[PDB]
Hints:
Three copies of one chain form a homotrimer. Chain A is of the alpha/beta class. Chain A has a single domain (1-114), classed as Macrophage Migration Inhibitory Factor, CATH 3.30.429. Helix content of chain A is 28%, strand content 30%. Chain A has helices at 18-30, 69-87; strands at 2-7, 38-42, 46-49, 57-63, 94-100, 106-108, 111-112. In chain A, strand 1, helix 1 and strand 2 form a beta-alpha-beta unit. The longest helix of chain A has 19 residues, at 69-87. Chains in contact: A-B, A-C, B-C. At the A-C interface, helix 1, strand 2, strand 6 and strand 7 of A face strand 3, helix 2 and strand 5 of C. The structure holds 3-(4-hydroxy-phenyl)pyruvic acid (3 copies). One 3-(4-hydroxy-phenyl)pyruvic acid (ENO) binds next to strand 4 of chain A. Chains A, B, C: GO terms for molecular function: chemoattractant activity; cytokine activity; cytokine receptor binding; dopachrome isomerase activity; identical protein binding; phenylpyruvate tautomerase activity; protease binding.
Amino acid sequence: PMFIVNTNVPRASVPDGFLSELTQQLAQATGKPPQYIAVHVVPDQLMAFGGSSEPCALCSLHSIGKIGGAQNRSYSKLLCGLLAERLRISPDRVYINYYDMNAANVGWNNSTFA
Amino acid sequence: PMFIVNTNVPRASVPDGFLSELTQQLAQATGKPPQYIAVHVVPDQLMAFGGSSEPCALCSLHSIGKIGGAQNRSYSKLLCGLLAERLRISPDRVYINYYDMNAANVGWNNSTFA
Amino acid sequence: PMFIVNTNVPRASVPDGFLSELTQQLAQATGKPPQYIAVHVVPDQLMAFGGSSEPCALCSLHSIGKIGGAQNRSYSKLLCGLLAERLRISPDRVYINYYDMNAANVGWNNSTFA
Ligand SMILES: *[C@@H](C(=O)C(=O)O)c1ccc(O)cc1
Ligand SMILES: *[C@@H](C(=O)C(=O)O)c1ccc(O)cc1
Ligand SMILES: *[C@@H](C(=O)C(=O)O)c1ccc(O)cc1
């Protein structure tokens, strides 16, 4: 799994330990080992949501399985709550795109997971 | 819908009001209310198109529905036109990836749109 | 084809000519003319892989066709090799997402490739 956060919140407001907290929480939520989880945080972005430049985030979660109707609602609760608590972003100004990847379409370590 | 523009144009060449103009134009084009539309502009990028570093842009438009053959041609004319007029990027150095998303795969406000 | 590299390696560690090298290697690997190939390198990113901030990369290769089980392994060897050689990133700290794009969902030059 890989999780990306793009946000207009400034770098200075991203707290220490945030990438590690994301890694641990995603490990718990998805059931996958933390050593496979990649997290990417992109602050200071030029963004608008609903025409407004108040804090917002556009996120993606890519996963080989563990993606689906019920699971995606659980991920959204978990991730919106983390973003609200740590970055002070309102949950109704966050979009998270969920992608269920075929293992043959993820390259790693000079091969793919096929 | 969410629209993202990556470009090597510098931030200073991104005109004031560009994010609002994109929000308005995408609302018109998709028929969705502007309160739903998210826009992300990323300037100053290290990019090449066809092996050259002249202005170029790599964009994505994600939408729940309203994606398809003829619609995508219409969006391309609209968006290439804006990028040409506002950022001085030639339409043959723009790629726009179109993604039709399932409502169950878009999180927002602690749940999904499903 | 479009190829994106996101990495926490610093901007100064990216060799001049890296974009041109990527363009030629991808043209050879996919069999597509280099005029069509777009490359985007994003250094200095706030990233973690497996909970650790050592150099890593998250990449995407989008292509209209030429995506599949065997192809994707040969791509992964080539790209992992090049990132290891040139940016000093260990190949087990790289993810490459492969996307097969329909031509009707790729806009370019005021239209689509359909
Ligand atoms: C993480 C991973 O290894 C898994 O098994 O889910 C991952 C998932 C999806 C993509 O595209 C890259 C890494
Ligand atoms: C915008 C939106 O909510 C709609 O009605 O389509 C949107 C579409 C798709 C994605 O992935 C995020 C936001
Ligand atoms: C490159 C291209 O034009 C091809 O022939 O595949 C390309 C492929 C896919 C996307 O999304 C953008 C550009």
